[PDB]
Design a protein around this nucleic acid. Sequence first.
DNA 1: ATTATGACGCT
DNA 2: AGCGTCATA
Length: 430
Amino acid sequence: GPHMATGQDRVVALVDMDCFFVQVEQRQNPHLRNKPCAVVQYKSWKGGGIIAVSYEARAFGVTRSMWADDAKKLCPDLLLAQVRESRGKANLTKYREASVEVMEIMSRFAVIERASIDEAYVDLTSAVQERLQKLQGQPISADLLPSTYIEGLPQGPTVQKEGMRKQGLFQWLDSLQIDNLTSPDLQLTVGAVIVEEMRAAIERETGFQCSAGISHNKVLAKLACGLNKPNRQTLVSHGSVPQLFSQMPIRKIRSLGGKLGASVIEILGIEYMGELTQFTESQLQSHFGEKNGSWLYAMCRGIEHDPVKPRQLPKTIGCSKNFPGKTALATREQVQWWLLQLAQELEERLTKDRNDNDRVATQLVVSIRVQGDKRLSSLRRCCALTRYDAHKMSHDAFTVIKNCNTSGIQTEWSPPLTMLFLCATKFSAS
DNA sequence: ATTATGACGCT
DNA sequence: AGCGTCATA
Ligand SMILES: [Mg+2]
Ligand SMILES: [Mg+2]
């Protein structure tokens, strides 16, 4: 009763830029705005691979991972923007720099954890306390929440989308004002006010739109974010969790979209997150291990404690290129040349990093894949990284991998290499 | 022949 | 340390 913790101590948001690489290209090229548009890398093989898709194009069935030639079959008028190529490979610098624009704006409001190139968790707990003070018990007006959905409302005893949104928001705010909700619900609401402000500042100062989730932890905030896209934000309250989870496929929850989630479904014979509540913590630990079991037991109740880490910068800076099909690297100098290409981009990004962020990478990570091997990495070896010099890094990389070559002939490379990867890690303050 | 990333867990 | 998992544009 009085001692059951409810995972309602924090306010956490997850902000995710809508179709981010597409918005970066649309800001640069006004001709692409408000059109079915996608971003593609390379062009020769089947028109290139799509890596981002505008919501106008999604309506035609265009998706990420699709070949541009195939996307054009679904959407003949699809417009395309190409990822820059430098030194023979895709170069994502424009999007990394746009990401920094957005992350720096978010950081004015609160501590953020960079979760990917286009999304960040926000810990709003302190900001909410301060805003609550500034307020002096004044009601929160719907006008402060013009793009917010309250998940699960309206309910109980209009056929337009925006009308539905406001109906639910009014029920929520009516109940908050009447004192029929909880202090955590008030805290979430103020959290949502702050995220409207954050999202307005991002759009004003960059041109970019985003969606966001506001809840009591990272997992719920991420889930919330996806419920109403694009350009909207969603509040998932603790109380909304039983109904939300009762029909929520397990694979939709962050970290359960893969093999673990599949085993939860198979071993337990269930489909929805809410069905997990019927098992004891020990039962879940017996199937999924101590850590995952405890996590599952709390998560299916809407409770999770993973903190928003104070980390706005990436921990690693990496450079990779696949060499698929017949392009697999088969000669020694081929391997050396591409190692150099990679090492040159890496040096460029590392020198920029050292200047911007007052740190130095100390470990060089070399990874390769060989043909018809594994998936992903076949092999991964570390060596020291003492100097930001591309020729040295490339020579060093060759050294740690050169004995992978099973060839008799040292000029030839067998089995052919289908992937090269250089990654700088173990940063120290400098 | 999605590609190019990036974080974290296991042993 | 090296490998595997899960995720994002
Ligand atoms: Mg996303
Ligand atoms: Mg994202």
